[PDB]
Design a protein around this ligand. Structure first.
Ligand SMILES: *[C@@H]1O[C@H](CO)[C@@H](O[C@@H]2O[C@H](CO)[C@@H](O)[C@H](O)[C@H]2NC(C)=O)[C@H](O)[C@H]1NC(C)=O
Ligand SMILES: *[C@@H]1O[C@H](CO)[C@@H](O[C@@H]2O[C@H](CO)[C@@H](O)[C@H](O)[C@H]2NC(C)=O)[C@H](O)[C@H]1NC(C)=O
Ligand code: NAG
Ligand code: NAG
Length: 487
């Protein structure tokens, strides 16, 4: 921070810069009015050169490289010329590829040394040396920071030691496994930046713009059993996300929401879509338009934990994570994709059931959505959801017609119906009565009243591991939870 001429903190040896059609932003600090020349080299050969100057009343400089085909290695040099003085900066083993930012709370923070099969996962790096990794230090700030205050893991080739460095240290398992899966598909460099902090609500990760857009109340005394990390508005946006916003990138994956179970829960269907839109706007502008204005944003629908049976804050958050549609992308969440995780539970996790150890399936399901939404591939990435319902009240039956094929295991409490009688509505279990390839028939005979709604898997812990009642027969994806109201 005392060195006058330097790169921004996202720039280092071994990094990945965003590939074509975007141009990669390179920025740093230097002496006011100095000229800065940025050169991309392949050893001694000049690939491209960009020239700029440090603005007269600020001490930063920025260039945008021409778009690059993925691959490498390259070296980036920056030279500051100021009068008769010459200072140079150099980073090597630079690759061009897709840069993904991974963020959220503790289930993004959980590292490869904490997951199932860790020994073998930590050893599987030789084929993935072009999946480069980076982890942001846990820092909060009361104002937006221009540059990261601290980096835990600077850009690196993956090794046993840095993938599994410590419990909730680095490297994020969901992030790593997502990138590894993407590398299998894309076969060009992937950069992974993890920026997460356990026990944090979405308000900490939101700029003031998205909070204002949602009418979020002014902060009071926020800390509780479920909010254990920084909870002041925007303090993690300020320090751990905003400093990256000028860096060109491909997309974001996100795993957060547990700490909103009792913190502006009823606003999460606003604050999460608003965060996505605000990060998009801010990163698009910061990167001089190079990051896509609607860059793909993927997220994990909350998994389960062993809660009180009556607690339905997690089901509410899961619904709000989809802006109350049940699926993404949707009208309020364009170019988003979701991994369902409620069936990826872990009764015996040494980190608590709130921190389940199967991150492999989470990253697999995320990478399906990325392939479809971020890369345009015709790959199934959504689980079966009803597209219409037919109530046969005289027969005591409710037909659910699904838009995909279903594989169904008998489970007479996973569906519930809202039965309104005697001036009250109660949720009653709805047994499964009959099955066809895309139609499930529920029995409603226990409802001696009017049927107002139906819901599925509306519980904090709806099933045992990979034993939810409804899956697609071959995509491996579970039916997502939902609620649907009768006309
Ligand atoms: C444990 O981790 C290892 C390493 O990732 C897995 O073995 C790899 O499995 C993939 C399939 O996902 C193969 O494509 C690779 O060739 C394997 N690599 C190595 C080095 O063996 C193994 O499948 C994992 N097992 C469990 C139960 O998670
Ligand atoms: C990172 O992006 C921000 C925008 O989000 C840049 O700030 C803008 O800079 C332009 C050009 O100097 C000004 O006209 C705008 O008023 C600035 N906007 C804001 C909101 O500050 C910022 O300069 C970028 N960082 C670097 C190093 O260039
Ligand atoms: C959060 O803001 C409150 C109220 O302004 C203040 O007491 C404190 O400085 C902040 N907390 C932390 C941990 O920074
Ligand atoms: C968010 O959910 C709450 C609680 O169900 C509801 O009252 C509100 O209308 C929802 N808002 C949006 C924008 O979906």
């Amino acid at each position: 921070k005392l060195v006058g001429f330097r790169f921004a903190s996202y720039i280092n040896n071994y990094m990945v810069l965003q590939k074509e059609p975007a141009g990669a932003v390179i920025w740093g600090y230097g002496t006011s009015e100095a000229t800065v020349t940025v050169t991309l080299y392949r050893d001694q050969e000049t690939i491209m050169e960009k020239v700029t100057s440090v603005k007269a009343h600020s001490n930063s400089w920025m260039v945008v490289l021409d778009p690059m085909k993925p691959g490498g290695p390259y070296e980036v040099m920056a030279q500051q010329t100021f009068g008769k003085t010459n200072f140079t900066l150099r980073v090597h083993d630079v690759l061009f590829g897709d840069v993904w930012l991974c963020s959220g709370q503790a289930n993004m923070q959980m590292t490869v040394s904490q997951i199932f099969n860790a020994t073998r996962e930590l050893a599987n790096t030789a084929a993935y040396q072009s999946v480069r990794i980076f982890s942001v230090s846990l820092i909060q700030a009361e104002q937006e920071l221009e540059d990261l205050a601290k980096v835990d893991l600077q850009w690196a080739k993956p090794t046993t030691e840095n993938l599994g460095h410590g419990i909730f240290q680095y490297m994020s398992a969901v992030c790593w496994l997502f990138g590894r899966n993407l590398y299998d598909t894309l076969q060009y460099p992937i950069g992974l930046i993890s920026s997460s902090w356990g026990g944090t609500p979405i308000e900490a990760w939101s700029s003031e713009r998205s909070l204002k857009a949602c009418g979020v109340p002014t902060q009071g005394f926020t800390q509780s059993n479920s909010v254990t990390g920084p909870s002041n508005h925007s303090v993690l946006w300020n320090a751990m996300i905003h400093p990256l916003h000028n860096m060109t990138l491909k997309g974001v994956i996100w795993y957060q929401g547990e700490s909103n179970m009792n913190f502006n829960r009823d606003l999460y269907n606003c604050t999460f879509p608003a965060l996505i839109e605000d990060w998009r706007q801010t990163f698009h502008h910061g990167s001089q338009g190079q990051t896509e204005r609607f860059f793909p944003f993927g997220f994990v629908q909350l998994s389960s934990y062993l809660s009180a049976p009556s607690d339905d804050t997690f089901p509410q958050i899961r619904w709000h994570q989809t802006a109350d549609f049940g699926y993404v992308p949707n009208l309020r969440m364009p170019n988003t994709f979701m991994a369902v995780a409620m069936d990826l539970c872990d009764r015996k996790s040494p980190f608590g059931s709130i921190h389940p150890r199967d991150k492999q399936t989470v990253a697999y399901r995320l990478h399906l959505g990325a392939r479809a939404v971020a890369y345009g591939e015709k790959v199934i990435f959504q689980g079966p959801l009803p597209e219409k319902m037919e109530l046969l009240a005289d027969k005591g039956l409710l037909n659910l017609m699904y838009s995909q094929e279903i594989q169904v295991q008998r489970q007479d409490k996973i569906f519930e119906i809202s039965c309104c009688s005697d001036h009250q509505c109660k949720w009653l279990p709805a047994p499964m009565d009959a099955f066809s390839a895309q139609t499930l028939t529920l029995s409603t005979g226990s409802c001696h009243g009017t049927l107002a709604a139906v819901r599925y898997a509306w519980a904090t812990w709806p099933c045992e591991y990979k034993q939810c009642p409804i899956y697609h027969p071959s995509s491996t994806l579970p039916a997502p939870p939902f609620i649907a109201f009768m006309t």
